[PDB]
Swiss-Prot record:
Name this protein carries in UniProt: Lysozyme C
An example Gene Ontology biological process: killing of cells of another organism
Presence of the UniProt keyword Hydrolase in the record: yes
Role noted for this protein: Lysozymes have primarily a bacteriolytic function; those in tissues and body fluids are associated with the monocyte-macrophage system and enhance the activity of immunoagents.
GO molecular function: lysozyme activity; metal ion binding
Catalytic reaction(s) noted: Hydrolysis of (1->4)-beta-linkages between N-acetylmuramic acid and N-acetyl-D-glucosamine residues in a peptidoglycan and between N-acetyl-D-glucosamine residues in chitodextrins
Self-association state and partner proteins as the record states: Monomer.
Pfam family for this entry, one: Lys
Location of the C-type lysozyme domain: 1-129
Note on how the cofactor is bound: Binds 1 Ca(2+) ion per subunit.
Family: Belongs to the glycosyl hydrolase 22 family.
Amino acid sequence: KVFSKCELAHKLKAQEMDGFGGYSLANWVCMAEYESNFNTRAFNGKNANGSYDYGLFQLNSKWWCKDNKRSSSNACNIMCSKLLDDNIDDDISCAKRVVRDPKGMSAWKAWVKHCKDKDLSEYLASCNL
Ligand SMILES: [Ca+2]
């Protein structure tokens, strides 16, 4: 599934992401745009580390989810394939676990590169009155 920006914003809002970990809904949506281009089937086989990144939030196979091709801490207690389907509730629950760790949203390198310290005041302007 490929979300529209505003579709994703409203989904994330409904799952209590606005201000989650201190980060605005715009920040959460921005991370998704630059990590996966809003595509739930996004997949990066060789990360800079060596691990693989899965789904809308590009969750890695070393710390967060498990596939059976490398060792994983599997901190989200989830098969990596479940981050490639259309429904993102489990992706969201995992991203909530990820942000509470010491880097916060800087865990996501594409968020750091494209969204961090940027003015997102108009980023979700089309999604609300
Ligand atoms: Ca999923």
